[PDB]
Coordinates of C-alpha atoms and ligand atoms in Angstrom, one line a residue:
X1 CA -26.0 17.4 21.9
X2 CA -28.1 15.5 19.1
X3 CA -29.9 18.1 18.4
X4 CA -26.9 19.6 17.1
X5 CA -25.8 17.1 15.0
X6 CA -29.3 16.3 13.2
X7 CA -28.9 19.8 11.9
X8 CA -25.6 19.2 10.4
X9 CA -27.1 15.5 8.7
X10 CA -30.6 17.9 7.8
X11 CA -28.0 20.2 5.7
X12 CA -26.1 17.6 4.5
X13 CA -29.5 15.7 2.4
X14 CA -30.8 18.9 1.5
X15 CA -27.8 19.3 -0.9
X16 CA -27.9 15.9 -2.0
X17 CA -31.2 16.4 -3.0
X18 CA -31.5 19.7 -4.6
X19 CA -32.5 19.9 -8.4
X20 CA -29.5 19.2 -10.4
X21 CA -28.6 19.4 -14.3
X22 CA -25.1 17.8 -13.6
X23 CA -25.8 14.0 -12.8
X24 CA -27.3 14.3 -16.7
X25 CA -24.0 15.6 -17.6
X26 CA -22.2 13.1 -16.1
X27 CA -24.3 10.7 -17.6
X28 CA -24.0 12.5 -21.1
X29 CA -20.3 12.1 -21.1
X30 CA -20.2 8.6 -19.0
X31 CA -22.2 6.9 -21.6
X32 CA -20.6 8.4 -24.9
X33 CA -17.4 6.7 -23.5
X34 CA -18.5 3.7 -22.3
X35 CA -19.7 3.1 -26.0
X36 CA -16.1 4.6 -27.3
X37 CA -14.6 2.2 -24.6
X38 CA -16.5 -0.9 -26.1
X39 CA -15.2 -0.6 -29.8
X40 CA -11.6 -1.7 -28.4
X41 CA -11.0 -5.1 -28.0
X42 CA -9.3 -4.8 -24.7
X43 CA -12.1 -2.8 -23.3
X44 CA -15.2 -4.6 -24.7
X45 CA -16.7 -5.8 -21.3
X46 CA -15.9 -2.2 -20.1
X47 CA -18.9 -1.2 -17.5
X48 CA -20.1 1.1 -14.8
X49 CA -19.5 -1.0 -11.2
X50 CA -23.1 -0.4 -9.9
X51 CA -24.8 0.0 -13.1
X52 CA -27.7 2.6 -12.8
X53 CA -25.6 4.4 -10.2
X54 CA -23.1 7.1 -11.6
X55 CA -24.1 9.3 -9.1
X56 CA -21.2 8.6 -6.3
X57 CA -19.7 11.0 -4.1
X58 CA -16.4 10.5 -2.3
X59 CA -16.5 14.3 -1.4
X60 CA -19.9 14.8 0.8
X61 CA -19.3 18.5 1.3
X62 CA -18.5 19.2 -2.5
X63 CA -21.7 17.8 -4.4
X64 CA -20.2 18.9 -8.0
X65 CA -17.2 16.6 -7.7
X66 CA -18.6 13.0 -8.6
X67 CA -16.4 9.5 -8.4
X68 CA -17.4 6.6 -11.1
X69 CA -15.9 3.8 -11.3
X70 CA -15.1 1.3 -14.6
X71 CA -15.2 -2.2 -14.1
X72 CA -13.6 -4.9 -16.5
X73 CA -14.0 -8.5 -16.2
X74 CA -10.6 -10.7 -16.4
X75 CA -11.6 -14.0 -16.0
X76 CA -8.6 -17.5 -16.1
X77 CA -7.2 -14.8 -13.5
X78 CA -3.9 -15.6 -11.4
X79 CA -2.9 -13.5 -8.5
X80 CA 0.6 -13.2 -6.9
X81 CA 1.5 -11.3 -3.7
X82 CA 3.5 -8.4 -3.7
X83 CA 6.4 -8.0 -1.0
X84 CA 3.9 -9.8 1.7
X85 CA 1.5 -6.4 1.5
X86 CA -1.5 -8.8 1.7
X87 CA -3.5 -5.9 -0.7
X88 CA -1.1 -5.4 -3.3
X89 CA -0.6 -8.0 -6.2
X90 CA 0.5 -8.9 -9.5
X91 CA -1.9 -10.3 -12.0
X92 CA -1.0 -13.0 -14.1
X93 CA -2.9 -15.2 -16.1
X94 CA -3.8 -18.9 -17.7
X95 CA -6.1 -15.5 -26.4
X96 CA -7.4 -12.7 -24.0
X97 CA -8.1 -9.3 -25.2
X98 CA -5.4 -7.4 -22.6
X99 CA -2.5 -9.5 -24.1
X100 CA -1.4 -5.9 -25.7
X101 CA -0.9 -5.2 -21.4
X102 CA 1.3 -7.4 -20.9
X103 CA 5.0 -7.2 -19.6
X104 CA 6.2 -10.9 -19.6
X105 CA 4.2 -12.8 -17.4
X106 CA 2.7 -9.5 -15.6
X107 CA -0.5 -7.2 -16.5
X108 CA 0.9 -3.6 -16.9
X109 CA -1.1 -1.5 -15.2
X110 CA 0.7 1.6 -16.9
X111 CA 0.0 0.5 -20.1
X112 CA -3.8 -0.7 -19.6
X113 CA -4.4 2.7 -18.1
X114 CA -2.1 4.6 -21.1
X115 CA -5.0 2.9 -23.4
X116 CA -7.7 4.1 -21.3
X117 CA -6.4 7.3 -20.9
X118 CA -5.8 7.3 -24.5
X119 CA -9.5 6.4 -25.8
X120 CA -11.2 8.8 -23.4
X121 CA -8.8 11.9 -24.2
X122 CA -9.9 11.3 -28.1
X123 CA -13.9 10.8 -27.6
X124 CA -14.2 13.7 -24.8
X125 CA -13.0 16.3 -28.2
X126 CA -15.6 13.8 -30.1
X127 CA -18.3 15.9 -28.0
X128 CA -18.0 19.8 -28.8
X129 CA -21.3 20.5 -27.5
X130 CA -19.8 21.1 -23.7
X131 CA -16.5 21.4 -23.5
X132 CA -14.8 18.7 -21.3
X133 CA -11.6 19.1 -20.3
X134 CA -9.4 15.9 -18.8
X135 CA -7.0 16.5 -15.8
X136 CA -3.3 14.8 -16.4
X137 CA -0.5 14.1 -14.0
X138 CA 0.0 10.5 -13.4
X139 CA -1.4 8.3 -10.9
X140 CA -3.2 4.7 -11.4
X141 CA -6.5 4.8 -9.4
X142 CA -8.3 7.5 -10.1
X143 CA -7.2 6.9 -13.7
X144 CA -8.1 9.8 -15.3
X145 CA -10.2 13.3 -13.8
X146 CA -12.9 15.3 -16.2
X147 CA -13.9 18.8 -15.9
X148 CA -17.0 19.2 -17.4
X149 CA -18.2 23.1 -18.2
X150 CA -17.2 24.6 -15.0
X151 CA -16.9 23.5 -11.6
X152 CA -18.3 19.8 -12.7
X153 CA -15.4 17.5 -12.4
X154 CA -15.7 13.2 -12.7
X155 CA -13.1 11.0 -11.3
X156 CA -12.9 7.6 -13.7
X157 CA -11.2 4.6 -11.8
X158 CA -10.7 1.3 -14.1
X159 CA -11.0 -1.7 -11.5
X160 CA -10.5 -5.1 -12.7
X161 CA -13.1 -7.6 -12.0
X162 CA -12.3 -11.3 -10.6
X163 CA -15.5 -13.6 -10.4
X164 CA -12.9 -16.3 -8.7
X165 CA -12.6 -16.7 -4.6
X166 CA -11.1 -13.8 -2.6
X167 CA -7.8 -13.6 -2.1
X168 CA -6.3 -15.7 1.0
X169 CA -5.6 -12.9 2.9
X170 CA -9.3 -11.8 3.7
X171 CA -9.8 -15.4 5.2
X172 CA -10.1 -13.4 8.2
X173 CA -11.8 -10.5 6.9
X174 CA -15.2 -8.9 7.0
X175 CA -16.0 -10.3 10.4
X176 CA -19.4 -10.1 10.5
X177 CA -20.4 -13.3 11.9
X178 CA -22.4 -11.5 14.9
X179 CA -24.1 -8.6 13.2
X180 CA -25.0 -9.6 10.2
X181 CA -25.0 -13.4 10.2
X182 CA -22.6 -16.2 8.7
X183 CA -25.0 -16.4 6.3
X184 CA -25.2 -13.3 5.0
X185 CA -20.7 -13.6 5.0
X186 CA -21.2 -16.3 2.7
X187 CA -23.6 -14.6 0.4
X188 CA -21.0 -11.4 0.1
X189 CA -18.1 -13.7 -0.2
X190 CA -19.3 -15.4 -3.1
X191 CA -19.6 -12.0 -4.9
X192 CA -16.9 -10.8 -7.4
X193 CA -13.8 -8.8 -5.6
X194 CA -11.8 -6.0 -7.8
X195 CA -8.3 -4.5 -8.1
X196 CA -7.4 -1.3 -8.9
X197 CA -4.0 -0.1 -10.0
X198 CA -2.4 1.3 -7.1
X199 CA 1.3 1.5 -5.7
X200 CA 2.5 0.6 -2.1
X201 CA 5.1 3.8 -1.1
X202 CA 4.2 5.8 -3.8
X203 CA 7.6 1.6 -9.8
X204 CA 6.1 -1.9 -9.8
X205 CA 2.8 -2.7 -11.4
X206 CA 0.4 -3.7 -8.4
X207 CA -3.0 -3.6 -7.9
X208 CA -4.6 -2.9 -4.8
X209 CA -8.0 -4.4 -3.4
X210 CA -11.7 -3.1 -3.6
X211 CA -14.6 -4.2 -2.0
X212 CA -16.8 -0.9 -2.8
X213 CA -19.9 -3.2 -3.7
X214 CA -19.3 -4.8 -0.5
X215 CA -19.7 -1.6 1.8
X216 CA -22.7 -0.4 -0.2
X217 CA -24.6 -4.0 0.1
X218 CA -24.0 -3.8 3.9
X219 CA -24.9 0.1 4.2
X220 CA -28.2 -0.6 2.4
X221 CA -28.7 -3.8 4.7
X222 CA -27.3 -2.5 7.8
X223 CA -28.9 -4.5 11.2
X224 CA -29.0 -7.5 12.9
X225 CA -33.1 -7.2 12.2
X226 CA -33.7 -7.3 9.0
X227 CA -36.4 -5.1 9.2
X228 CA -34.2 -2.6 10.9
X229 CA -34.9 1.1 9.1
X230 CA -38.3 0.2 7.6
X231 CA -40.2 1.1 10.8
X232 CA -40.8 3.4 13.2
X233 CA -39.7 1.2 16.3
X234 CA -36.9 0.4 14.4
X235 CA -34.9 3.0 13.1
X236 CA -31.3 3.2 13.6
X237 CA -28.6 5.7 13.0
X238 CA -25.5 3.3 11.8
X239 CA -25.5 6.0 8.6
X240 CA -25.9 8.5 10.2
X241 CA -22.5 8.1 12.2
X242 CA -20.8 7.6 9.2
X243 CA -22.1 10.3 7.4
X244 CA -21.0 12.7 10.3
X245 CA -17.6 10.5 10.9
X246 CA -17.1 11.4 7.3
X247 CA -17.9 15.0 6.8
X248 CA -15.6 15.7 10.3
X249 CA -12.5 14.5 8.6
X250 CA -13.2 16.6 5.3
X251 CA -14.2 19.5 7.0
X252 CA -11.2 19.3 9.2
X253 CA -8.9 18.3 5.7
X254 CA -10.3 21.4 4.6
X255 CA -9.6 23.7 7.2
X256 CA -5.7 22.6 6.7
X257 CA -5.8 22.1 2.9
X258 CA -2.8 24.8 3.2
X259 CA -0.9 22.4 5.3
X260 CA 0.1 18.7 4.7
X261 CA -0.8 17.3 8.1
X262 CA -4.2 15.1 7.2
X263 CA -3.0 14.5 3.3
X264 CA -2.6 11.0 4.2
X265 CA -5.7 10.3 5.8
X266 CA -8.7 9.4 3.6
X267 CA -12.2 8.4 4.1
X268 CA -10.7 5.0 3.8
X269 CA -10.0 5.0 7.4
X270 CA -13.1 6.5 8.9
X271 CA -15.1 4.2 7.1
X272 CA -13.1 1.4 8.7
X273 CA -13.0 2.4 11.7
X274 CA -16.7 2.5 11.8
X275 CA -17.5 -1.0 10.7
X276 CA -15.4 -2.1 13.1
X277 CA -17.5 -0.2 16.3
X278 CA -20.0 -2.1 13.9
X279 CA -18.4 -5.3 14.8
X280 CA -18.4 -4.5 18.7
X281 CA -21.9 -2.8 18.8
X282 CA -23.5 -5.5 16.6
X283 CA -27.3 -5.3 18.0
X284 CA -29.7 -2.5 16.7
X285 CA -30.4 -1.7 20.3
X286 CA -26.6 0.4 20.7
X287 CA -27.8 2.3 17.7
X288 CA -30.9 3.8 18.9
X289 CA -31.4 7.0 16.7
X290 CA -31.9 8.5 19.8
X291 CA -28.6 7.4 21.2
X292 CA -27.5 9.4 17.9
X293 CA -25.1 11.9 19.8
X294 CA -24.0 9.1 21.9
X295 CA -23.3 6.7 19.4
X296 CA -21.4 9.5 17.0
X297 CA -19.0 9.9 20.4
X298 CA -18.2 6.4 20.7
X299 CA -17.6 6.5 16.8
X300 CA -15.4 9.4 17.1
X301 CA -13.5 7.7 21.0
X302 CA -12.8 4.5 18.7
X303 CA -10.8 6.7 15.9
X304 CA -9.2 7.9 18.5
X305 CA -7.7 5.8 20.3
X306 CA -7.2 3.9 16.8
X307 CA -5.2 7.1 16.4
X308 CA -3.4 6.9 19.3
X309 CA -2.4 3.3 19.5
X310 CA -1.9 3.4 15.9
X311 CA -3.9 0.3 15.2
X312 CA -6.7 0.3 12.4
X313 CA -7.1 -3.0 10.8
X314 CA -8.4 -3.0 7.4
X315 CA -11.2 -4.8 7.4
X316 CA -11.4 -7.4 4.9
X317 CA -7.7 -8.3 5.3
X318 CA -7.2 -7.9 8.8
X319 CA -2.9 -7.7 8.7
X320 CA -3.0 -4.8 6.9
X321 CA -2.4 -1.8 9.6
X322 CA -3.4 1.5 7.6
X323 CA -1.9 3.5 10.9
X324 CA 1.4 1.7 11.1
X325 CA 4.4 4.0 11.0
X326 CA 4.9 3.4 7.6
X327 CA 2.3 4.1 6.2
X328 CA 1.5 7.6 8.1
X329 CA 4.1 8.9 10.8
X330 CA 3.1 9.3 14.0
X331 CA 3.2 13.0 14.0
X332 CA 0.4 13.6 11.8
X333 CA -1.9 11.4 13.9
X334 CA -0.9 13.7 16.5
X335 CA -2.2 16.5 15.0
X336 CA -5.6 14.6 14.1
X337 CA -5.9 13.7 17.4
X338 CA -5.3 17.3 18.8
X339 CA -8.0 18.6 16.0
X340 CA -10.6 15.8 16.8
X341 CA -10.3 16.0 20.8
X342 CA -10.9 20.2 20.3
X343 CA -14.0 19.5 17.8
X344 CA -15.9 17.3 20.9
X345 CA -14.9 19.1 23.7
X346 CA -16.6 22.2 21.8
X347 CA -19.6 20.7 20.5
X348 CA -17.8 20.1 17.0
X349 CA -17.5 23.7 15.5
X350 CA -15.8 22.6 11.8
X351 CA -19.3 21.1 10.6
X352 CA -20.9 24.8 11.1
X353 CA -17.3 26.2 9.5
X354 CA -17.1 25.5 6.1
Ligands
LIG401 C1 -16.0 -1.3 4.6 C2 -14.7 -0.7 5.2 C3 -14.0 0.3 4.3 C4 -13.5 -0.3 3.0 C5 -14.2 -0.3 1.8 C6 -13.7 -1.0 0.6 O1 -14.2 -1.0 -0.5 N1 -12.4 -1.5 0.8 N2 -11.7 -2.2 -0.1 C7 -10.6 -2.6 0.6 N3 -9.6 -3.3 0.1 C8 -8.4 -3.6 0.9 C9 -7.6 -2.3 1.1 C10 -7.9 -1.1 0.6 C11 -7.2 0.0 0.8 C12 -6.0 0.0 1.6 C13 -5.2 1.2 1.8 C14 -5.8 2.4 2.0 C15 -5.1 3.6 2.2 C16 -3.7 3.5 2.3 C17 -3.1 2.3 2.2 C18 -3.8 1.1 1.9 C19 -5.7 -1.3 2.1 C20 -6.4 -2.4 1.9 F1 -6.0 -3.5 2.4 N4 -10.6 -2.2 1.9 C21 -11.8 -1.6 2.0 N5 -12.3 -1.0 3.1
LIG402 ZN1 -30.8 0.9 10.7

């Protein structure tokens, strides 16, 4: 059965890596804002979150659509806790350049984001060579949507940028003690944490978590060995799962875009349940590449019994459920379920589908 699924990751690089004129595009129109962005006060320490890399795909089966992301520093930074959520806060503070943000003692994410809205809508018009068109209809993160010519489209998220201790809920977070080391914990808690403006049951002005830079640090040093990828004895397939984790629930999101049944699930929740199969299977030998078609089944029986129990700690802040019954009812897992059980038991048609 690996055979089958090699094909589908084979398919998958080959339009990653095909000749492209859009990541220049992107880059055209990222950089003329980011110097735009920098002439405001409030947005002088404006930059991309992995600088060099503008090239980030959320959408693996829709290479046109890319996803960057703005980071601002905001240091003397305060956090309060919003309604016990243990990911959404307040920020509040200790002359800073967002003082025009603020609602009394509270950073306005609606107003930050009306700003940033505002400076990009103007300097897209700025450039008349292409015509770039920006997407409207409110919601915080991802602040704004570009279409540039036809068929390119850019999501731009504006994440704050804490260089301060993580919050006390991740105390019990990123538990990767046994895979990756306490030492290497250490090192990734030390680094910077963001928020993003986002609402619990989407109005307060909260801001959710983001550890992006800490899921691409550990994707790009993956093993217990560190020399695990680099050889020929030693090459795994933790990417691979994930990779094929992820295009199953887009592929299956697309094959009921008509309905509403998986509208609430993201990659967000593949992508943790993964790390956490990381967490039980932490030695290189239990990801054999290949043990690739029996690895990618354990991947998927975790999901769903994560689906069925409806359990799936986050996985820096370990309290937060993203398949409680608030947050997305039990029939839709249900259905996700139904769709995923069908997909093994027939050798996964959906990646051969679309
Ligand atoms: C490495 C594993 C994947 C991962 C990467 C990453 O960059 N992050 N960043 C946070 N931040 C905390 C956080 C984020 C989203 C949600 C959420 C999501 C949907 C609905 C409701 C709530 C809840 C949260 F507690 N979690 C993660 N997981
Ligand atoms: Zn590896």
């Amino acid at each position: 059965g690996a055979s089958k699924l090699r094909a589908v990751l084979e398919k998958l690089k080959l339009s990653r890596d095909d000749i492209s004129t859009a990541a220049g595009m992107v880059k055209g129109v990222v950089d003329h804002l980011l110097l735009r962005l920098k002439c405001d006060s409030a947005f002088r320490g404006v930059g991309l979150l992995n600088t060099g890399s503008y090239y980030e795909h959320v959408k693996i089966s829709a290479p046109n659509e890319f996803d960057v992301m703005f980071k601002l520093e905001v240091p003397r930074i305060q956090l309060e806790e919003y309604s016990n959520t243990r990911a959404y806060y307040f920020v509040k503070f200790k002359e800073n350049p967002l003082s025009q943000f603020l609602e009394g003692e509270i950073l306005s994410a609606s107003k930050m984001l009306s700003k940033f809205r505002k400076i990009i809508k103007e300097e897209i018009n700025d450039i008349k060579d292409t015509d770039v068109i920006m997407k409207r209809k409110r919601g915080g993160s991802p602040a704004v949507t570009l279409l540039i010519s036809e068929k390119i489209s850019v999501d731009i998220t504006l994440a704050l940028e804490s260089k301060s201790s993580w919050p006390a809920s991740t105390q019990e977070g990123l538990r990767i003690q046994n895979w990756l080391s306490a030492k290497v914990r250490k090192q990734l808690r030390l680094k910077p944490f963001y928020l993003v403006p986002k609402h619990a049951k989407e109005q307060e002005e909260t801001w959710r978590l983001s550890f992006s830079h800490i899921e691409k640090e550990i994707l790009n040093n993956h093993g217990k060995s560190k020399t695990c990828c680099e050889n020929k004895e030693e090459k795994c397939c933790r990417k691979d799962c994930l990779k094929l984790m992820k295009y199953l629930l887009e592929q299956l999101k697309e094959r009921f875009k008509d309905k509403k049944h998986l509208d609430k699930f993201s990659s967000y929740h593949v992508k943790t349940a993964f790390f956490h199969v990381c967490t039980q299977n932490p030695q290189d030998s239990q990801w054999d590449r290949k043990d690739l078609g029996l690895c990618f089944d354990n991947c998927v029986t975790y999901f769903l019994q994560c689906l069925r129990t409806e359990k799936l700690e986050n996985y820096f802040i370990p309290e937060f459920n993203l398949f409680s019954s608030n947050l997305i009812d039990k029939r839709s897992k249900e259905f996700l379920t139904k769709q995923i059980e069908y997909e093994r038991n027939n050798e996964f048609p959906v990646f051969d589908e679309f």
